[PDB]
């Protein structure tokens, strides 16, 4: 469902190579976790925690609640990257080729 609703989340590369499954100490009371990316799986695990703690009864309601938490985190990252680029150019950072330029050359 998540990737049907958000097709472009597929375009974010995923690494299937595991590090150590036994080291994962995650507290799914919050979506962000140290050691793993923010992605669709973050939403699914958050939804399961909500239904497991019985905060929400219907899976749809827990899923929607997790989705909004995911949108908030995605918006804060989209701004941190835009602003970081803008701030660097304002202090004299120079870049050889942009993504748009790379595509034109190819």
């Amino acid at each position: 469902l998540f990737y049907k609703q958000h097709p472009w989340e597929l375009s974010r590369p995923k690494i299937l190579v595991e590090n150590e499954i036994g080291d994962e100490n995650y507290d799914w009371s919050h979506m962000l976790q140290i050691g793993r990316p923010l992605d669709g799986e973050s939403v699914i695990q958050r939804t399961m925690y909500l239904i497991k703690t019985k905060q929400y009864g219907d899976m749809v309601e827990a899923y929607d609640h997790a989705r909004y938490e995911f949108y908030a985190l995605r918006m804060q990252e989209e701004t941190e990257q835009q602003v970081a680029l803008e701030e660097a150019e304002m202090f004299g950072s120079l870049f050889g080729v942009s993504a748009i330029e790379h595509g034109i050359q190819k």
Partner: protein
């Protein structure tokens, strides 16, 4: 247990996909999850899949359908190019806006029944939204529902004679209204398509909120200039706009007044040259496509 671990494994995280890896139709959004391997693992053909990827593959990105097959191969294509389309859209810094002025899908808004006044439009959409349904499974929506709705006859044979008896003795124009509301009121509790698979907003292409200005050493940027390519040397047939290829997206380019003379000169090789464009707006259609409108900025 092993079963619990497997469900949370990184391979389990990738949703099942059997969509053609070689698709020649119209592509509007990514269809396969891009898999990435680090340089160290690539040196050892390790991708976190079932089997080693052939050493011929030098890319670090692939898309796959099946971990293994009856042909003893992995079904994969060594490409990861939809990520560059998304990152190029981000570089153009054009927020996606609703051409219908709808609420932002990424915000938990307090909505009301303003659009719920079409209860008969969407309550019947469940049986009438069957454009591509089987000739008999869709017919199972007629007897299966009839019994479910027919089980509420006693409830509606009492509520209607206790809340609107006049209509039952005068006219059914209002009775039909009480019927549409009754089923919906008794269906909101039910779970018919409780999960909606429609694309939500941008679908993840952009999480940028409109309003922010782009500061630059040369002042605030008022117009976004992006290199592009004109595909056709003659406007889209039946349309007053040409087509351009900007940043992995096909846009509709509107010219100031006239078309530059390089068009006639170049002809069908017009795509061989790069022009500068201005991205006016970017919209999202229900099919999941992006409607990008541009303007052929010409040196003046």
């Amino acid at each position: 247990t092993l079963a619990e671990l497997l469900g949370r494994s990184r391979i389990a995280q990738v949703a099942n996909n059997h969509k053609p890896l070689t698709y020649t139709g119209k592509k509007f959004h990514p269809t396969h999850q891009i898999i990435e391997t680090k340089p160290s693992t690539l040196y050892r053909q390790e991708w976190g899949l079932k089997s080693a990827i052939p050493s011929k593959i030098k890319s670090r990105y692939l898309v796959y359908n099946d971990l293994d097959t009856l042909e003893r191969i992995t079904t994969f294509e060594p490409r990861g190019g939809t990520q560059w389309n998304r990152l190029r859209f981000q570089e153009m810094g054009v927020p996606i806006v609703s051409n219908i002025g709808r609420q932002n899908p990424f915000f938990k808004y307090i909505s009301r029944p303003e659009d719920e006044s079409h209860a008969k439009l969407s309550l019947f959409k469940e049986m009438k939204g069957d454009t591509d349904i089987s000739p008999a499974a869709m017919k199972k929506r007629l007897k299966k529902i009839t019994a479910l709705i027919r089980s509420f006859q006693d409830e509606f044979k009492e509520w209607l004679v206790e809340n609107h008896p006049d209509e039952l003795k005068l006219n059914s124009n209002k009775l039909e209204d009480y019927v549409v509301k009754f089923l919906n009121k008794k269906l909101e509790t039910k779970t018919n398509k409780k999960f909606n698979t429609e694309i939500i907003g941008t679908g993840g292409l952009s999480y940028s909120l409109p309003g922010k200005l782009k500061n630059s050493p040369n002042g605030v940027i008022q117009r976004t200039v992006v290199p592009g390519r004109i595909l056709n040397v003659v406007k889209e047939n039946n349309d007053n706009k040409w087509l351009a290829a900007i940043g992995g997206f096909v846009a509709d380019v509107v010219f100031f007044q006239s078309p530059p003379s390089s068009f006639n000169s170049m002809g069908d090789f017009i795509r061989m040259k790069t022009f500068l464009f201005e991205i006016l707006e970017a919209s999202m259609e229900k099919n999941g496509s992006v409607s990008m409108h541009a303007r052929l900025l010409e040196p003046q």
